[PDB]
Ligand binder design. Structure first.
Ligand code: SF4
Ligand SMILES: [Mg+2]
Ligand SMILES: [Mg+2]
Ligand SMILES: [Mg+2]
Ligand SMILES: [Mg+2]
Ligand SMILES: [Mg+2]
Ligand SMILES: [Mg+2]
Ligand SMILES: [Mg+2]
Ligand SMILES: [Mg+2]
Ligand SMILES: [Mg+2]
Ligand SMILES: [Mg+2]
Ligand SMILES: [Mg+2]
Ligand SMILES: [Mg+2]
Ligand SMILES: [Mg+2]
Ligand SMILES: [Mg+2]
Ligand SMILES: [Mg+2]
Ligand SMILES: [Mg+2]
Lengths: 208, 99, 83, 99
RNA sequence: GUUGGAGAGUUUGAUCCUGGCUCAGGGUGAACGCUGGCGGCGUGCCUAAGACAUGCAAGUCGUGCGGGCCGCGGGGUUUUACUCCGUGGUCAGCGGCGGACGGGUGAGUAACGCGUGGGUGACCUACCCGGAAGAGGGGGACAACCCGGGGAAACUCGGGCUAAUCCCCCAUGUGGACCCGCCCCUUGGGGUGUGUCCAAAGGGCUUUGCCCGCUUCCGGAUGGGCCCGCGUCCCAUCAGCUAGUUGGUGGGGUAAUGGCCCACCAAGGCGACGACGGGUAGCCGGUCUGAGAGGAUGGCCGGCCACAGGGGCACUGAGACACGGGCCCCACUCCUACGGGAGGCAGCAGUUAGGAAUCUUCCGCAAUGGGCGCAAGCCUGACGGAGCGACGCCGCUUGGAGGAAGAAGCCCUUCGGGGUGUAAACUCCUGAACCCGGGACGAAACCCCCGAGGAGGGGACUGACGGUACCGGGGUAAUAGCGCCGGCCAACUCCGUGCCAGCAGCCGCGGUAAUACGGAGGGCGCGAGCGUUACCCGGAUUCACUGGGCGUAAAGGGCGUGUAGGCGGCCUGGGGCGUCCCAUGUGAAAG
């Protein structure tokens, strides 16, 4: 269903700090801030010219690995963006952050989407007062994302809820610590969430 | 082992046999008036349609000669006797013929 | 005759019937003449029962006798109220 | 809409029957060119005054024979034999493909 | 809030061009190789329209009629026996309605079969609805049953009764039909005049009434029959085809036109705008690809067609030339007591044969729907459900965080180190599976009461899916595999091998120091899937309508003349055939 394997390889393989672990991510023991080169034997060895097809695959893999997702959903939730009216490249980045397993991460209830998906799947997060245990939940506007009161007392949430206290939430969300409920405001733009992705390449990728 | 509603065959055959009768009865009967209307007479001939007609309709009370198929015979048969009769005769006794 | 039956659709475990008129000897889901309202018995909406109460009295006048689960619906919509 | 059609005859050679040849002109569903397609109909002339050269009209009528389901309607002009040639000559071009 | 177009390798010492082959993409009713957890919705014999064991899928009505049979109450000659009245149920039969719908297939068909638009002055439609007028008398038939006789069953015969919503006659005639004239549009439409002909059923209960029926007639709605214009695959190496053919007169025939059938007449009919013949093929809405144009496909959903082992046949009914009705020839199969009989899964399961391959001989009318009796209710392999199969789509899990200037093994080296790598172990955190307790939606009507059997309202019984979904509480870290790593094409080193073993879609590599073969370490891509093969579209501007060429690359007929056809100088007027604009109908639903 998901990756479940070695993560820091992803970050090295793409030459970009993929913030997937959690607190170790910004620490000075981030594998990229330790070994910033592609893994596996031929790391320090001279990397030849990137084939014109290469750099368009990797950025596609960056986003793929940033959100923790397969490649059918990636495609299928990309097909929709291509058909849905608007700029193909950032509608796709809209239906992505709309995914439930993302939002919880953006709400700081977890420091990792990979961490967040478990909490979603385990019956801890609540939308509009319902036990939604689905990661792939297209969160719509005006929705009530909150930690289930039946499980709003664990030794994990509070630590990471407190961990936010007064964090600069995404300029598109509404976080209430201790209230534990975070409302989905508008919907994102690339200019609102800057990532190391030339998302246009993913287009130019998925058009070959 | 089989459909006891096979009874419809019984009902069918006795209906069939009780159809071939009256339908054929119109035949030889109305085959009699024409020759009589041809060979001359009208009293003992226009009397025949009188009953012939009555039978065609009576066939139309049931599923035999049904519909306006009578109105195919009840129209083309009393269509010829006229033309048959002016050939030596002229429309004689007061039977089924209007004027 | 001609019937005011229903036509079941929707996902399995989600019967969505179309209050419709076919001829009697027609399949459940065939070339009907007139849909005259949707019907869900599982109650998913507040407007869960529409009925053309005027167009019904068309086919009801020209001769369309319906089924039990079809007569009561016209009552639940109020086709027989006229007073 | 009982399909009125207008076309030149082709024959006057059968009793109460003629051979209207009508012409259809239309594009080509694949090529922008506008092409010709023609078809031969058999018609009902009970007056036997519709003859060769007569440019007439025909109508989708009740069945009259096997290949005769149209009636003649009215006349447009009679002096048109130079078209009958174009039928008379074409079918005589058909001659020279044999042994 | 819908929008659209990528190329690459390969001939040569080398280059450009034409040119072909091969590949990356999307889809599959797919199979196979290696893996394999759960749930929701779908889908699943393309091959032999080959053969089928067995079960089941077409019945319903005592408020139609008579009868055998069983319970219950009443009985009679004072009487055995028995016989009878009433009520319930069952067996069958006469009768009415349904077995022409439903469900399966794709052989056939190159056709008005389908699609589209029309026409019907050429017609049909029981059960439905609306309106008008009626049901007075009389006769009778055959089964059921009784008697006898035959056969193993199949079955059948001969005699004798009888009831009825059964048959038949007469009586009346709202009114319908018909020959012959007359009033108007015009194909047989609409009236009317005289003549002729045509009707009927009873059952019930709360009988001075109501329900359910019957007969004649007109109209609506639905559902059909037929005719027509138009589009519908290849082969010109099929260039002529035609004796019901082509038109008519007349008769027949059906609900209706028809050369559909027959008789006589006259020679006409079709064809290079492709007749006739051959091959393939059900058609459409749709589906796949393609930017588009186009190209291929119509399984499952829905519409039409045709078929029920091959073939013909008609009856019955309003409706069939009827899958589970009948008859007859052919082929096949099955049964026996041998004289003789019977059968038709291309209906749901299920077997066999063919195959690379294809589901449980399950549950229930609870729901929708259908047929019957008004009604309780019966039947319903239509259906609603579950069962199998990664066949498809979607969703989800095999943990999360912290965690070593970095354990072990394995791999590489220039021996200093470098890689697997937060990967492991470890601490904490939740808790797929598991356990208990509650427990659905789908199900409110048919029925009953008040009420007129109206309107309206009140009351009550009913679940296969399923103790499922879900909900409340408790509780364990717990399956990962496959392909590739020379360019296309993302992703590198070691070893053995030494034209051998082998790989390989095109190029090609291996002829000792291989990034291509076999293995490992590692890396790339996907992931409960990954690869192979096959097919469809593309890429193929490589059949060029959009969108190509013919000096030397494949291509100008050896030339001339010329029919059909294609094309055509300037000006003016008309009709408006192609053409263009607006409205309206259609373009069904699902897509
Ligand atoms: S940021 Fe997090 S996931 Fe990325 S290399 Fe560092 S520790 Fe690993
Ligand atoms: Mg033509
Ligand atoms: Mg534009
Ligand atoms: Mg007509
Ligand atoms: Mg009609
Ligand atoms: Mg002719
Ligand atoms: Mg075929
Ligand atoms: Mg059968
Ligand atoms: Mg016989
Ligand atoms: Mg039922
Ligand atoms: Mg599954
Ligand atoms: Mg690739
Ligand atoms: Mg060698
Ligand atoms: Mg061109
Ligand atoms: Mg040369
Ligand atoms: Mg030539
Ligand atoms: Mg429309």
């Amino acid at each position: 269903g998901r990756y479940i394997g070695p993560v820091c390889r992803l970050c090295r393989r793409e030459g970009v700090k993929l913030y997937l672990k959690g607190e170790r991510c910004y620490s000075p023991k981030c594998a990229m801030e330790r070994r910033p080169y592609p893994p596996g034997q031929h790391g320090q060895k001279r990397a030849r010219r990137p084939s014109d097809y290469a750099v368009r695959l990797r950025e596609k893999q960056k986003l793929r690995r940033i959100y923790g997702i397969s490649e059918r959903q990636f495609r299928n939730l990309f097909e929709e963006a291509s058909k849905k009216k608007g700029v193909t490249g950032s509608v796709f980045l809209g239906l992505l952050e709309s995914r439930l397993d993302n939002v919880v991460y953006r709400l700081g209830f977890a420091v990792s989407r990979r961490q967040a998906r478990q909490l979603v799947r385990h019956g801890h997060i609540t939308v509009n007062g319902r036990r939604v245990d689905l990661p792939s939940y297209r969160v719509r506007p005006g929705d009530e994302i909150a930690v289930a009161e039946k499980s709003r007392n664990l030794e994990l949430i509070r630590q990471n809820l407190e961990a936010m206290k007064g964090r600069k939430v995404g300029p598109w969300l509404s976080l209430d610590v201790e209230g534990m409920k975070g409302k989905f405001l508008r919907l994102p733009d690339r200019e609102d969430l800057a990532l190391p992705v030339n998302e246009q390449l993913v287009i130019e990728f998925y058009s070959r | 082992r089989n459909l006891s509603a096979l009874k419809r065959h019984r009902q069918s055959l006795k209906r069939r046999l009780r159809n071939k009768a009256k339908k054929s009865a119109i035949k030889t009967l109305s085959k009699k008036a024409v020759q009589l209307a041809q060979e001359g007479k009208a009293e003992e001939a226009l009397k025949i349609m009188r009953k012939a007609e009555s039978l065609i309709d009576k066939a139309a009370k049931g599923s035999t000669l049904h519909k306006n198929a009578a109105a195919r015979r009840k129209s083309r048969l009393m269509r010829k006797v006229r033309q048959l009769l002016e050939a030596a005769g002229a429309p004689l006794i007061g039977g089924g013929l209007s004027a | 005759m001609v019937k005011i039956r229903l036509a079941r659709f929707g996902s399995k475990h989600n019967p969505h019937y179309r209050i419709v008129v076919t001829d009697a000897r027609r399949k459940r889901d065939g070339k009907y003449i007139e849909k005259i309202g949707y019907y869900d018995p599982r109650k998913t909406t507040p407007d869960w029962l529409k009925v053309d109460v005027e167009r019904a009295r068309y086919w009801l006048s020209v001769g369309a006798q319906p089924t039990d689960t079809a007569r009561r619906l016209l009552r639940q919509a109020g086709v027989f109220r006229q007073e | 809409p009982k399909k009125v059609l207008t076309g030149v005859v082709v024959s006057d050679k059968m009793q109460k029957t003629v051979t209207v040849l009508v012409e259809r002109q239309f594009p080509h569903p694949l090529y922008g060119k506008v092409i010709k397609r023609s078809k031969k109909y058999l018609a009902h002339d009970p007056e036997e005054k519709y003859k060769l050269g007569d440019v007439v009209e025909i109508i989708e009528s009740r069945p009259i024979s096997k290949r005769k389901r149209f009636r003649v309607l009215r006349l447009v002009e009679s002096g048109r034999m130079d078209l009958v040639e174009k039928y008379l000559i074409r079918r005589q071009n058909y001659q020279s493909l044999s042994k």
